């Protein structure tokens, strides 16, 4: 187990994806509800883990 499931939680495919610290999910940046454009500073959570009101 390394670098999440190595798959975009929106495409189920590959490419450059960002791993979530709250769960084993990766995203195509723009594939996120809110697009990163420039990857977070340090840690990061996906929309869901983000709804939890934690962030990073």
């Amino acid at each position: 187990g390394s670098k999440n499931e190595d798959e975009c939680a929106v495409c189920r495919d590959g490419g450059e994806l960002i791993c979530c610290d709250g769960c084993p999910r990766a995203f195509h940046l723009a594939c996120l509800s809110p697009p990163l454009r420039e990857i977070p500073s340090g840690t990061w959570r996906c929309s869901s883990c983000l709804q939890a009101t934690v962030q990073e």
Partner: peptide
């Protein structure tokens, strides 16, 4: 954040649960 550059296939993977509402 840890954003890797994976390259999976395109045919399917795993289906634990059913469709999501």
């Amino acid at each position: 954040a840890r954003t890797k550059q994976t390259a999976r296939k395109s045919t399917g993977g795993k289906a634990p649960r059913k469709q999501l509402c």
